């Protein structure tokens, strides 16, 4: 299941949906009073959950006859909440926009609750701003694919997310692009983020010191770059930081022998899969220094170049096989890794985005590291397995679970607008 917590919330809402909304599906009239009654019922449930989250935050920071928070007993796979969530307020806002309580035949959905949770997380940080002594946002990180641009895409100059990233940098907020795309070379990132770095360079609104608060953490936690601008020349872009300056102690402790054996085992497994699944020859296995993956290809013939893709069932088969085999392999158990299905491909990366975000939290301010409660990672891959390379970011900070580049822009708009 994609998220036990969201599915749990969805199931709770089903009872008042059936009893107070479906019971009126054949109504001739009185549409509004029914809507307001449904709305109150849902709101009450979100208010209750809001209270369970506060209760869990208190439990988690102090440390029940069963040795767990109430909400953990209710939802065993639940992650950590680094901030409270104004769920009732967020429900009421989303209901006004989406008219959830006005439905009579379609229950509150997974995506409804996903939206409500994102809006609650945004609302929490908007509140901190208006607060004296506010626990304000200090780090916003983004996945690339599906989050900043279409899958496999680049950030072109007319991309509407760019003004919002510049506004984050302008407000003093640190911005990291934490992406599985893993290049030991600034040039490739400069091409894929070209529109963003040109707009940032062109900006006269932003001090250079703040422009340089833009970073890339590539390969999830393998390659760190920082935006630079030395006016001596018309030169700007990204410069790589040596890993000795930013690798976390736990990562420094890993054996490079275990790193290598992990990638070798994954590569061998991908080759085995490619033969067993009789994949088209145009499909490629790509081995990198800190990753290995399998990707689509292309062929001629129409008189037309056409993509050569893996089926959905093959991608699922491959990512499950990699994940399960590596969880049973001693060298990969001694380090960390992330396997994911990106939609059209499957990769195994050394490390993971929890390590990438945590690395940035310290890198940006070694003397007073950015806290999880001050961090927001935005991405699309939040399933626990499969479409999953953002999932571990929940270990390092708050998250926003988006579904498209358009959602990312909508949420940054609401985060940053004046209300
Ligand atoms: O090292 C890696 N680890 C995991 N995913 C990668 C890596 N390199 C590239 N990707 C992703 O794989 C796809 C193909 O990469 P591209 O051809 O370099 O753009 C894109 O979705 C990339 O973002
Ligand atoms: O199991 C979980 N599912 C969804 N969100 C979670 C979970 N655990 C912790 N959070 C956090 O709740 C906020 C709103 O979704 C986000 O910060 C998310 O990371
Ligand atoms: Mg993505
Ligand atoms: Mg590549």
From Swiss-Prot:
<feature type="binding site">
    <location>
        <position position="115"/>
    </location>
    <ligand>
        <name>ATP</name>
    </ligand>
</feature>
<feature type="active site" description="Nucleophile">
    <location>
        <position position="143"/>
    </location>
</feature>
<dbReference type="GO" id="GO:0006190">
    <property type="term" value="P:inosine salvage"/>
</dbReference>
<comment type="function">
    <text>IMP-specific 5'-nucleotidase involved in IMP (inosine 5'-phosphate) degradation.</text>
</comment>
<keyword id="KW-0460">Magnesium</keyword>
<dbReference type="GO" id="GO:0000287">
    <property type="term" value="F:magnesium ion binding"/>
</dbReference>
<comment type="similarity">
    <text>Belongs to the ISN1 family.</text>
</comment>
<keyword id="KW-0378">Hydrolase</keyword>
<dbReference type="GO" id="GO:0071590">
    <property type="term" value="P:nicotinamide riboside biosynthetic process"/>
</dbReference>
<dbReference type="GO" id="GO:0071592">
    <property type="term" value="P:nicotinic acid riboside biosynthetic process"/>
</dbReference>
<dbReference type="Pfam" id="PF06437">
    <property type="entry name" value="ISN1"/>
</dbReference>
<keyword id="KW-0479">Metal-binding</keyword>
<feature type="binding site">
    <location>
        <position position="353"/>
    </location>
    <ligand>
        <name>IMP</name>
    </ligand>
</feature>
<dbReference type="InterPro" id="IPR009453">
    <property type="entry name" value="ISN1"/>
</dbReference>
<feature type="active site" description="Proton donor">
    <location>
        <position position="145"/>
    </location>
</feature>
<keyword id="KW-0067">ATP-binding</keyword>
<dbReference type="GO" id="GO:0050483">
    <property type="term" value="F:IMP 5'-nucleotidase activity"/>
</dbReference>
<feature type="binding site">
    <location>
        <position position="143"/>
    </location>
    <ligand>
        <name>IMP</name>
    </ligand>
</feature>
<feature type="binding site">
    <location>
        <position position="380"/>
    </location>
    <ligand>
        <name>Mg(2+)</name>
    </ligand>
</feature>
<feature type="binding site">
    <location>
        <position position="179"/>
    </location>
    <ligand>
        <name>IMP</name>
    </ligand>
</feature>
<feature type="binding site">
    <location>
        <position position="145"/>
    </location>
    <ligand>
        <name>Mg(2+)</name>
    </ligand>
</feature>
<feature type="binding site">
    <location>
        <position position="145"/>
    </location>
    <ligand>
        <name>IMP</name>
    </ligand>
</feature>
<comment type="subunit">
    <text>Homotetramer.</text>
</comment>
<feature type="binding site">
    <location>
        <position position="345"/>
    </location>
    <ligand>
        <name>IMP</name>
    </ligand>
</feature>
<keyword id="KW-0546">Nucleotide metabolism</keyword>
<keyword id="KW-0547">Nucleotide-binding</keyword>
<dbReference type="GO" id="GO:0005524">
    <property type="term" value="F:ATP binding"/>
</dbReference>
<dbReference type="GO" id="GO:0009117">
    <property type="term" value="P:nucleotide metabolic process"/>
</dbReference>
<protein>
    <recommendedName>
        <fullName>IMP-specific 5'-nucleotidase 1</fullName>
        <ecNumber>3.1.3.99</ecNumber>
    </recommendedName>
</protein>
<feature type="binding site">
    <location>
        <position position="143"/>
    </location>
    <ligand>
        <name>Mg(2+)</name>
    </ligand>
</feature>
<dbReference type="InterPro" id="IPR036412">
    <property type="entry name" value="HAD-like_sf"/>
</dbReference>
<feature type="binding site">
    <location>
        <position position="151"/>
    </location>
    <ligand>
        <name>IMP</name>
    </ligand>
</feature>
């Amino acid at each position: 299941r994609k998220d036990e917590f969201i599915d749990w919330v969805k199931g709770l809402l089903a009872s008042p949906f059936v009893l107070h909304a479906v019971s009126h599906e054949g109504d001739y009239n009185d549409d509004l009073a029914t809507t307001q009654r449904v709305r109150s019922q849902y709101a009450d449930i979100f208010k209750d959950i809001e209270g369970l989250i506060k209760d869990k935050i208190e439990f988690d920071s102090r440390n029940n006859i069963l040795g767990q928070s109430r909400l953990n007993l209710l939802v065993p796979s639940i992650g950590t909440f680094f901030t409270e969530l104004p769920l009732e307020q967020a429900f009421l806002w989303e209901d006004s926009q989406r008219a959830i309580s006005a439905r009579r035949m379609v229950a509150p959905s997974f995506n409804d609750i996903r939206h409500i949770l994102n809006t609650a997380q945004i609302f929490h940080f908007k509140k901190q701003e208006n607060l004296h002594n506010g626990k304000v946002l200090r780090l916003v990180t983004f996945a690339g694919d599906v989050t900043l641009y279409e899958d496999g895409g680049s950030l072109v100059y007319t991309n509407p997310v760019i003004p919002y990233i510049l506004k984050l940098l302008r407000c003093g907020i640190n911005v990291g692009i934490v992406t599985a795309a893993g290049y030991d070379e600034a040039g490739t990132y400069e091409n894929r983020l070209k529109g963003l770095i040109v707009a940032l360079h062109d900006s006269t609104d932003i001090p250079v010191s703040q422009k340089q608060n833009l970073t890339i953490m590539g390969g999830e936690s393998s390659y760190l770059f920082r935006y630079y601008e030395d006016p001596e020349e018309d030169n700007f872009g990204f410069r790589q930081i040596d890993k000795e300056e930013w690798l976390l102690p736990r990562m420094k402790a890993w054996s490079l022998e275990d790193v290598e054996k992990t990638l070798d085992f994954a590569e061998r497994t991908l080759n085995r899969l490619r033969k067993r699944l009789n994949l088209p020859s145009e499909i490629s296995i790509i081995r990198k220094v800190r990753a290995v993956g399998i990707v689509p290809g292309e062929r001629y013939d129409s008189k037309r170049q056409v993509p050569v893709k893996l089926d959905r069932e093959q991608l699922e088969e491959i990512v499950l096989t990699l994940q399960n085999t590596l969880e049973s392999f001693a060298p990969s158990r001694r380090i960390q890794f992330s396997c994911f299905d990106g939609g059209s491909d499957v990769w195994c990366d050394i490390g993971g985005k929890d390590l990438g975000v945590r690395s940035l939290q310290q890198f940006y301010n070694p003397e007073s590291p950015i806290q999880p409660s001050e961090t927001l990672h935005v991405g699309d891959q939040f399933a626990p397995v499969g479409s999953a390379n953002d999932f571990k970011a929940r270990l390092a900070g708050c998250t926003l679970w988006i579904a498209s580049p358009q959602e990312t822009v909508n949420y940054l708009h609401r985060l940053l607008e004046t209300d």
